Amino acid sequence: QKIGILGAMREEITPILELFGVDFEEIPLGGNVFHKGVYHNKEIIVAYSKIGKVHSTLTTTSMILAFGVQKVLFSGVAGSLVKDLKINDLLVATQLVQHDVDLSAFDHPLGFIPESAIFIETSGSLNALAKKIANEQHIALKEGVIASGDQFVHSKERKEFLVSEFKASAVEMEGASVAFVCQKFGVPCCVLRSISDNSFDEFLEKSAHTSAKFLKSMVDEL
Amino acid sequence: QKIGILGAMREEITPILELFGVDFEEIPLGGNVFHKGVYHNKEIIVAYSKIGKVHSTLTTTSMILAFGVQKVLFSGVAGSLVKDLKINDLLVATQLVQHDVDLSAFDHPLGFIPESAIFIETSGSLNALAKKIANEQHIALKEGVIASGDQFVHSKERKEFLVSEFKASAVEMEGASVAFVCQKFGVPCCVLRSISDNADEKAGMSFDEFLEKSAHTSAKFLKSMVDEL
């Protein structure tokens, strides 16, 4: 019943809270703010992830430990790595990878850490729900691997590495760490991304509002 | 009180559990196992995070939120970036940076993330305690900057960058994230490392050879600190 909602764009949080139309208590924790509301007999906890893998790991672990969320939906933007994945497309992550993990000094494959795995899994059930919602709304939902790392990726060389090494379709900075924490705690997680590059501000205000609606649509089925 | 004691790898906490010599209850949570014991009217919670920034951020958050630790002492091994830090030498990190953070595309300095800072500080009180113990026990203890990132550094070129960009004295993969989480929760943190390698082309070999001894060196020092708390 307890549902966590994370946005990688801080600008999306208010649209989300407003759309749900219930009272949210602001609860400070670990230098972030978590918004707690009750919506149709569910606790809904909403937060901005903050930027990068340490911030987003902290936020997600805090959300799970302090509030006991049982499912997590994570919205945000991503850069495309493939020609067919265009600006404004919606992408659900089937798997994620931390693209900047490198223990090659010990002859490990890139992306791999001992006692872990290169690829991070996401929720089949939630992904199918996102697909159901997109289908109903006649939105094309694309699926693929999302690569995340603490660098903003822009060079052709690095983009080609992401595609060749990890078969990544898109890249951003928080998805993998959030999905990772959820996996460690046995919490179903869905990572959804609007493709923002292949006006930024104009793109964002529109994208943030449609994302809020999409997330609520999912929660209304949960 | 409750004290959290963290390493990144099993080899880094084995000597810790042995040195304390008490019974530990094993408690699973979030993919970690926490070892909970009582040592001279202190509750100690010991775990290894597994390697890297996400692992260590997660485990530190668990120590604080789930186990209520009031201080965190991190013990383990690191690569030296300076000639005065030799294999087995001890360093206490007074500032730490995430050396692999790069938002330069947004015209931010390297290491910087919005709402944060390039350098994170550790506990003045605990660092002072470390320095006093080292002096009293005739142990060399350097104080300096540790750079942390999700790559195990093993190249002269990267070492030079770390020194020139961040004035780092040593490099590893968890310190900055642990110290960051502690700061966000107002929990004193001390990061101690013993040198296992020179972060160069032979770093993997040196690490394999010296992990056990260096891990022990840091662990024994951490124990001496807890004995003073």
Swiss-Prot record, chain A:
Lineage: Bacteria, Pseudomonadati, Campylobacterota, Epsilonproteobacteria, Campylobacterales
Active-site residues per Swiss-Prot or TrEMBL entry: E12, D197
UniProt cross-references to Gene3D superfamilies, sorted A to Z: Nucleoside phosphorylase domain (3.40.50.1580)
Organism, scientific name: Helicobacter pylori (strain J99 / ATCC 700824)
Family that this chain belongs to: Belongs to the PNP/UDP phosphorylase family. MtnN subfamily.
Taxonomic superkingdom: Bacteria
Purpose: Catalyzes the direct conversion of aminodeoxyfutalosine (AFL) into dehypoxanthine futalosine (DHFL) and adenine via the hydrolysis of the N-glycosidic bond; this reaction seems to represent an essential step in the menaquinone biosynthesis pathway in Helicobacter species. Also catalyzes the hydrolysis of 5'-methylthioadenosine (MTA) to adenine and 5'-methylthioribose. Can also probably use S-adenosylhomocysteine (SAH) as substrate, leading to adenine and S-ribosylhomocysteine.
The protein's Enzyme Commission number: 3.2.2.30, 3.2.2.9
SUPFAM superfamilies, sorted: Purine and uridine phosphorylases (SSF53167)
Activity regulation summary: Is inhibited by the transition state analog BuT-DADMe-ImmA. This compound is also able to inhibit H.pylori growth and is more efficient than antibiotics commonly used in ulcer therapy.
Annotated keywords: Amino-acid biosynthesis, Hydrolase, Menaquinone biosynthesis, Methionine biosynthesis
InterPro entries: MTA_SAH_Nsdase (IPR010049), Nucleoside_phosphorylase_d (IPR000845), Nucleoside_phosphorylase_sf (IPR035994)
Keyword Amino-acid biosynthesis belongs to the record: yes
Sequence positions that bind substrate: G79, V153, M173, E174
Catalytic activity: 6-amino-6-deoxyfutalosine + H2O = dehypoxanthine futalosine + adenine; S-adenosyl-L-homocysteine + H2O = S-(5-deoxy-D-ribos-5-yl)-L-homocysteine + adenine; S-methyl-5'-thioadenosine + H2O = 5-(methylsulfanyl)-D-ribose + adenine; 5'-deoxyadenosine + H2O = 5-deoxy-D-ribose + adenine
GO BP, sorted A to Z: L-methionine salvage from methylthioadenosine; L-methionine salvage from S-adenosylmethionine; menaquinone biosynthetic process; nucleoside catabolic process
A GO-annotated cellular component: cytosol
Signal peptide residue numbers: none
Single GO term (MF): methylthioadenosine nucleosidase activity
UniProt keyword annotation of Metal-binding present: no
Pfam families, sorted: PNP_UDP_1
Name of protein: Aminodeoxyfutalosine nucleosidase
Pathway(s) it belongs to: Quinol/quinone metabolism; menaquinone biosynthesis; Amino-acid biosynthesis; L-methionine biosynthesis via salvage pathway; S-methyl-5-thio-alpha-D-ribose 1-phosphate from S-methyl-5'-thioadenosine (hydrolase route): step 1/2
Subunit structure: Homodimer.
UniProtKB/Swiss-Prot annotation, chain B:
Activity regulation field: Is inhibited by the transition state analog BuT-DADMe-ImmA. This compound is also able to inhibit H.pylori growth and is more efficient than antibiotics commonly used in ulcer therapy.
Disulfide bond residue pairs: none
Listed CDD domains: MTAN (cd09008)
Gene3D superfamilies reported in the protein's UniProt record: Nucleoside phosphorylase domain
E.C. designation(s): 3.2.2.30, 3.2.2.9
Binding-site positions, substrate: G79, V153, M173, E174
Single annotated GO MF: adenosylhomocysteine nucleosidase activity
GO CC terms: cytosol
Function per UniProt: Catalyzes the direct conversion of aminodeoxyfutalosine (AFL) into dehypoxanthine futalosine (DHFL) and adenine via the hydrolysis of the N-glycosidic bond; this reaction seems to represent an essential step in the menaquinone biosynthesis pathway in Helicobacter species. Also catalyzes the hydrolysis of 5'-methylthioadenosine (MTA) to adenine and 5'-methylthioribose. Can also probably use S-adenosylhomocysteine (SAH) as substrate, leading to adenine and S-ribosylhomocysteine.
Family, as annotated: Belongs to the PNP/UDP phosphorylase family. MtnN subfamily.
Assembly notes: Homodimer.
Full protein name: Aminodeoxyfutalosine nucleosidase
Organism: Helicobacter pylori (strain J99 / ATCC 700824) (Campylobacter pylori J99)
Name of the gene encoding the protein in the UniProt record: mtnN
